[PDB]
């Protein structure tokens, strides 16, 4: 009767509500099934661009990957210049997810923490490789024209459609800008 | 007769919840299920409830940022320097989707540009003839740094303090 | 948006606040970058208005 | 007209108000140039009355 | 006959008041020449009684 | 028999009463010569307790 | 049993109270010798709470 | 749980409380070791808010 | 919006006034202004004079 009709319509409505999928313009998110979302669509998993989508209620779980530039700041660091004088560099790096599938697969998890620590390690390694050849006066004078652009280009290319495994392009991340906020001296020199 | 009254009630609630208001100074970005529907002018407006969402953004207002720091000069000298940066939001989709938290990004870019410009000049030259040249070069460096990020922010003015 | 009172204070002393409107216990706080957040007063503070005024912060009453 | 409390205090400190009728929180300010407006006290300000009397400003209560 | 608060304090400091009949906010004021009028306390004043007792004027209350 | 608040203050300033039974606004006062009366506080007076405590005048509250 | 406020403050300065349960207008007090009594604030005194805190005297509020 | 006000005072002096949520009369204290309890104010203490601020203790109001 | 024009006016006037006041000393700008420095600033703002 009408009670059964009401029950069935409300049940299909709540099923639709549980199965509705929404993706915001800012971020691109792919479904997280326990077993199979990895290696979907042969090698490259689905991207799931923003828009309406349909999902199985319980076989998978919602999760989102951000799709705009992020900033990672190194609060403090210690570097040795050519003349063996310690320097403290506080710098921020801006990174954008280039390819989402490779970003998800290469990083241990979808969380940005793993990619952030990988980027921090590689950037710090390259920075300590580069700054060691220079002197503190040259560092404080024209760093942007001799350190930041060169570090960014090297980190993108990977020196020292061919992709170097050493390069960050192998990871889904891409570096868009590197700047040096603050430079400090050891307390003795200060 | 019950179904017709129910339909009338639900469409009335639909229309009633559809209306919303946007302040005169602000603009809006409306997205239907996250597809960036369009740009919305201030006033009273209508949208399909539970379908599209509107995000308001202050465009008319002028925003100010203060950047201060102990900074190293060319002649192995440290100086405390303060600046104020005035900027305003344009093309709000860029301000909303290009960079997370554009204000913090602009603050960091301002600090970096300030360091870059102050590194070139010596202490006494700053302390005496700072305002003009330091402000001009700082503004140029800051706009050059902001440009690649392609945020909606337009740099209204930078002034020495 | 709800923001607690302490960080509102060290934002005031670090002059990131531009206009504060106090209808009752609550304060409608606007920052210099035109971001607004509500704050709740835990208990009446005689030094609150003095600190707000000395930092050249715009203060608005309510009907 | 409504004028903000901090602006009213800046005005009285600059010798621009003549008489102030205080009705609880509400205050009816008359400037020296025969312009009248209304302001509201945000919170209990002990310094307000002292500032008004010090700057030779007429103060009038109401029933 | 109603007299403002500022001129009443001026008279108190200039010693032309004998006794003050304080009834809540209202103050029924009698001058030293037995002149009667009424003044109003606009906002809670923390120092009026200090000056009143300093000038040695008979202050009374009302049930 | 009712006594002025001011007169109460110069009387207790002369060390002449012993007990002060404080009942809200009204106070039951007994002098050193066993004379009892009532006095009324015009407004809230913070210095009252300090003056009464300093001059060894006993105070008692009421339920 | 009710104990006079002047005697209470003197006894507190004597460091002989251990706990004081304050009920707004009321105070429930335990001496160091396990003697229980009850006293009253005549009028609001922050110096009371200051004296109890500096004397390391337990203070107890209740819902 | 419930904790004495003086206990809270000496506790915040030694810097091991983190979050203090003020709901009018009541206080919900959060310790540095994730311990939560409840405290009550004896009487209005102006020094409380200043003391909590100077020791970098988060303070959160409630509607 | 008025704000951008006001900021541009502030910048141009501040630069012009800084130049003019750097040209002169304290006595010339304190004792006898007589609408000389100010008139120069005004008619340098209304034209392309530098």
Distance CA(B97)–CA(A8), nearest Å, equals 41
Q: Could you tell me the sign of the dihedral formed by the alpha carbons of G7, G11, G16, G17, in that order?
A: positive
**Token reading at I21:** 């006041």
Return the C-alpha torsion angle B157, B161, C6, C8, nearest 10.
-30
Strands B26-32 and B38-40: antiparallel
Cβ within 8 Å of B, C 14-43: 15-16, 32-35
**Token reading at B41:** 């002018």
Instruction: Give all strands (DSSP E) within A75-116, no chain letters.
Output: 79-80, 86-97
- Residues sharing a CB contact under 8 Å with residue I6, sequence separation 6 or more, in sequence order: none
**Token reading at A142:** 């024209």
CB B63 within 8 A of CB B88: yes
Phi, psi of F40 (to 5 degrees): -120, 135
Strands E17-23 and E58-60: parallel
Closest partner residue to G43 (CB to CB) among F49, F53, F57 is F49
- Residues sharing a CB contact under 8 Å with residue F32, sequence separation 6 or more, in sequence order: F15, F16, F17, F18
Distance CA(G26)–CA(H28), nearest Å, equals 24
- C-beta neighbour count of C47 within 10 angstroms: 12
Strands D26-31 and A53-54: unpaired
Q: Taking Cα atoms as reference points, which of I33, C40, A147, H2 lies closest to residue G60?
A: H2
Q: Looking up tokens 């008319």, which residue turns up? A: B60
Closest partner residue to G53 (CB to CB) among H6, H25, H39 is H6
Coil, strand, or helix at residue B98? coil
Return the C-alpha torsion angle A177, A180, A181, A187, nearest 10.
160
Q: Taking Cα atoms as reference points, which of I8, I12, I18, I25 lies closest to residue B128?
A: I18
Which residues share a beta bridge with F39?
F3, F27
Strands B19-22 and D26-31: unpaired
> Which own/partner pairs from F37-40 qualify as long-range (CB within 8 Å, at least 24 positions apart)?
F37/F1, F37/F2, F37/F3, F38/F1, F38/F2, F38/F3, F39/E61, F39/F2, F39/F3, F39/F4, F39/F5, F39/F8, F40/E60, F40/E61, F40/E62, F40/E63, F40/F2, F40/F5
Report in angstroms the alpha-carbon separations of E18 from B85, E28, E52, E59, I7: 62, 11, 10, 9, 61
Distance CA(C19)–CA(C27), nearest Å, equals 10
Coil, strand, or helix at residue D29? strand
Phi, psi of B143 (to 5 degrees): -70, -40
Residue D33 distance to chain C (closest CA, Å): 23
* Residues of D in Cβ contact (< 8 Å) with E37: none
Q: Please, which experimental method was used?
A: cryo-EM
> Which own/partner pairs from C23-32 qualify as long-range (CB within 8 Å, at least 24 positions apart)?
C23/C62, C24/C62, C25/H61, C25/H63, C26/H63, C29/C3, C32/B63, C32/B64, C32/B65, C32/B66
Cβ within 8 Å of E, F 5-44: 5-7, 9, 25-26, 39-43
Which helix (H) or strand (E) segment holds residue C30: the answer is strand C26-31
Query: Does C3 lie at the interface with H, CB-CB under 8 angstroms?
Result: no
Taking an 8 Å cut-off on Cβ atoms, the answer to whether B112 and A66 are in contact is no
CB B155 within 8 A of CB B143: yes
Return the C-alpha torsion angle F2, F7, F11, F12, nearest 10.
80
Coil, strand, or helix at residue A141? helix
* Residues of F in Cβ contact (< 8 Å) with G5: 59-61
Distance CA(C14)–CA(G13), nearest Å, equals 43
**Token reading at E54:** 């300093």
**Token reading at A176:** 């868009």
Q: Could you tell me the sign of the dihedral formed by the alpha carbons of H34, H35, H41, H47, in that order?
A: negative
Cβ burial, residue A58 (10 Å; 0-12/13-18/19+) = exposed
Return the C-alpha torsion angle H47, H48, H50, H56, nearest 10.
150
Which helix (H) or strand (E) segment holds residue I20: the answer is helix I2-23
CB B117 within 8 A of CB B138: yes
Distance CA(E39)–CA(E52), nearest Å, equals 14
Taking an 8 Å cut-off on Cβ atoms, the answer to whether C35 and B61 are in contact is no
Distance CA(A179)–CA(A8), nearest Å, equals 60
CATH (domain of B83): 3.30.479.30
Distance of CA E59 to the CA centre of its chain: 8
CB D42 within 8 A of CB C51: no
- 8-state DSSP, A96: E
Distance of CA E6 to the CA centre of its chain: 10
Phi, psi of B108 (to 5 degrees): -65, -40
Residue C60 distance to chain D (closest CA, Å): 5
CB F45 within 8 A of CB E49: yes
Coil, strand, or helix at residue H57? coil
Residue A99 distance to chain B (closest CA, Å): 17
Report in angstroms the alpha-carbon separations of I39 from A121, B85, I8, I9, I18: 62, 31, 19, 16, 15
Which domain, by its residues, includes B92? Answer: 62-161
**Token reading at G2:** 């009710």
Task: Give the side-chain half-sphere CA count within 13 A for A26.
Answer: 17
Cβ burial, residue A7 (10 Å; 0-12/13-18/19+) = exposed
Show the CA angle centred on residue A108, arms to residues A104 and A112, nearest 5°.
65
* Residues of E in Cβ contact (< 8 Å) with F5: 59-61
Cβ burial, residue A91 (10 Å; 0-12/13-18/19+) = buried
Closest partner residue to E5 (CB to CB) among D41, D50, D59 is D59
């Amino acid at each position: 009767m009408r009670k059964s009709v009401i029950a069935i319509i409300i049940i299909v409505l709540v099923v639709l509500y549980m199965s509705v999928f929404v993706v915001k313009e800012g971020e691109r998110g792919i479904t997280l099934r326990f077993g199979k979302v990895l290696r979907d669509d042969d090698n490259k998993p689905l991207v799931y661009e923003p828009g309406l989508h349909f999902k199985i209620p319980f076989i998978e779980t919602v999760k989102m990957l951000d799709a705009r530039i992020q900033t990672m700041d190194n609060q403090a660091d210690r570097f040795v210049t050519k003349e063996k004088k310690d320097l403290i560099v506080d710098s921020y790096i801006k990174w954008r997810i280039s390819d989402f599938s490779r970003y998800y697969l290469a990083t241990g998890g979808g969380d940005i923490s793993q990619a952030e620590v990988l980027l921090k390690r590689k950037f710090s390694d390259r920075l300590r490789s580069e700054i060691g050849r220079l002197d503190v006066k040259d560092i404080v004078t024209d760093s942007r024209g001799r350190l930041t652009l060169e570090v960014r280009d090297a980190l993108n290319s990977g020196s020292a459609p061919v992709i170097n495994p050493n390069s960050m392009a192998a990871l889904g991340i891409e570096v868009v800008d590197v700047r040096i906020k603050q430079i400090n001296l050891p307390t003795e020199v200060s | 007769r019950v179904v017709t009254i129910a339909a009338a009630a639900i469409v009335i609630i639909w229309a009633a919840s559809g209306f919303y208001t946007i302040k005169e100074a602000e603009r809006g970005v409306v997205t239907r299920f996250g597809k960036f529907s369009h740009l919305v002018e201030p006033g009273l407006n209508w949208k399909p409830t539970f379908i599209d969402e509107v995000k308001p953004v202050n465009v008319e207002a002028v925003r100010e940022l203060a950047a201060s720091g102990v900074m190293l000069t060319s002649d192995e000298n440290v100086v405390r320097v303060e600046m104020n940066v005035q900027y305003r939001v344009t093309n709000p989709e860029k301000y909303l989707y290009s960079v997370t938290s554009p204000d913090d990004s602009l603050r960091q870019a301002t600090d970096s540009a300030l360091r870059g410009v102050i590194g070139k000049y010596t202490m006494d030259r700053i302390l005496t003839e700072g305002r003009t040249v330091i402000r001009s070069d700082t503004q140029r460096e800051l706009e050059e740094t902001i440009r690649p990020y392609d945020m909606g922010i337009t740099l209204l003015d930078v002034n020495f303090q | 948006r709800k923001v607690d009172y302490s960080t509102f204070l060290q934002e005031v002393n670090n002059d990131q606040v531009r206009e504060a409107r106090i209808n009752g216990r609550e304060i409608n706080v606007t920052k210099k970058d035109s971001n607004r957040y509500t704050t709740y007063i835990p208990v009446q503070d005689p030094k609150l208005l003095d600190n707000l005024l000395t930092k050249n912060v715009k203060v608005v009453g309510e009907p």
